[PDB]
Amino acid sequence: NSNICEVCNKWGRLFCCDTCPRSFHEHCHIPSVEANKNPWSCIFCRIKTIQERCPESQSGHQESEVLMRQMLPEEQLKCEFLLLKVYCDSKSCFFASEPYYNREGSQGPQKPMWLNKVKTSLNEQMYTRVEGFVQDMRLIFHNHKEFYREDKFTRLGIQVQDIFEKNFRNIFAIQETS
Ligand SMILES: [Zn+2]
Ligand SMILES: [Zn+2]
Ligand SMILES: [Zn+2]
């Protein structure tokens, strides 16, 4: 197995996957690494199994159909994985914890949102459709763009949104377009 966490790239107290060489901090994995389970298979492995059991699941889909799906176990897992792919980027640090807003010439968002809030919401099964999760995720970046205006710091929101959107299209097999 790897000697660093797949998500944050640090050593520490690592739980190792039994079916692939990845390792994780307990709360870096999503869901948090399960108490028992021998063998244990990481989220990457679990997602790969879904694809292998249903190869046609990789054919293209329309985003509008994906968003309306109910959060059954496989869609729950896919959203967890997509959240984890965002935390994999070090720039997610800016969006992880609860923000505050006090900048001359700007007003804070009406509905603040952050990664850890989305993480809790998934853990608590608060989303009934994929659309709930995707809307909160996109809101993170939209709030940031609006608040930071013409400051160059706005670019961090564009960057992390691009990671989110690329991974959304991959994990949910969105039909490729020009
Ligand atoms: Zn970690
Ligand atoms: Zn694995
Ligand atoms: Zn099938």
Side-chain angles (χ1 to χ4, degrees), residues 1-36 38-178:
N1 289 87
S2 183
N3 308 332
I4 56 174
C5 181
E6 187 75 0
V7 183
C8 72
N9 299 107
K10 298 293 194 279
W11 179 75
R13 181 58 195 119
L14 300 174
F15 303 84
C16 287
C17 184
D18 289 312
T19 52
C20 78
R22 303 175 175 93
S23 317
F24 305 82
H25 299 103
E26 175 166 13
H27 298 312
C28 279
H29 197 271
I30 309 181
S32 291
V33 169
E34 297 74 14
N36 210 285
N38 318 62
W40 178 76
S41 265
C42 81
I43 192 156
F44 291 81
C45 286
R46 301 168 65 189
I47 289 289
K48 184 206 295 306
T49 292
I50 302 318
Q51 287 171 23
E52 287 180 347
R53 290 179 164 153
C54 288
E56 68 272 31
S57 72
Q58 302 161 280
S59 294
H61 299 78
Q62 297 297 108
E63 178 173 316
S64 60
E65 176 270 320
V66 168
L67 297 186
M68 290 307 309
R69 296 182 189 162
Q70 298 179 17
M71 290 284 258
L72 293 183
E74 291 188 354
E75 307 312 306
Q76 176 81 28
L77 193 71
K78 285 180 169 204
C79 295
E80 291 165 348
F81 190 46
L82 176 47
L83 180 60
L84 173 136
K85 286 289 187 156
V86 174
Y87 280 103
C88 290
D89 197 280
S90 63
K91 291 161 179 283
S92 70
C93 68
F94 296 111
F95 298 104
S97 71
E98 188 174 1
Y100 63 87
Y101 298 99
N102 195 3
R103 181 199 188 235
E104 184 181 334
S106 286
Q107 269 290 327
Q110 306 289 312
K111 184 177 170 183
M113 195 49 60
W114 58 101
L115 299 171
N116 293 348
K117 185 173 171 62
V118 178
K119 183 178 275 201
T120 295
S121 296
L122 275 174
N123 175 240
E124 291 179 5
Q125 301 161 300
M126 298 294 305
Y127 299 113
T128 58
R129 290 172 197 272
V130 173
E131 180 176 47
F133 166 79
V134 171
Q135 284 172 341
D136 278 352
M137 297 288 288
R138 290 174 168 165
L139 185 63
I140 300 171
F141 313 114
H142 194 257
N143 282 352
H144 176 96
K145 285 164 68 177
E146 296 300 297
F147 181 70
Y148 293 104
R149 303 292 197 104
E150 313 299 286
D151 196 289
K152 66 197 173 162
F153 191 59
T154 59
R155 178 159 174 263
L156 270 293
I158 293 169
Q159 293 173 321
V160 181
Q161 182 152 22
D162 195 43
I163 298 298
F164 172 71
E165 298 295 342
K166 287 183 189 273
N167 282 280
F168 174 71
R169 289 187 306 269
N170 178 264
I171 292 166
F172 289 95
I174 298 296
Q175 174 61 52
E176 289 276 288
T177 52
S178 52

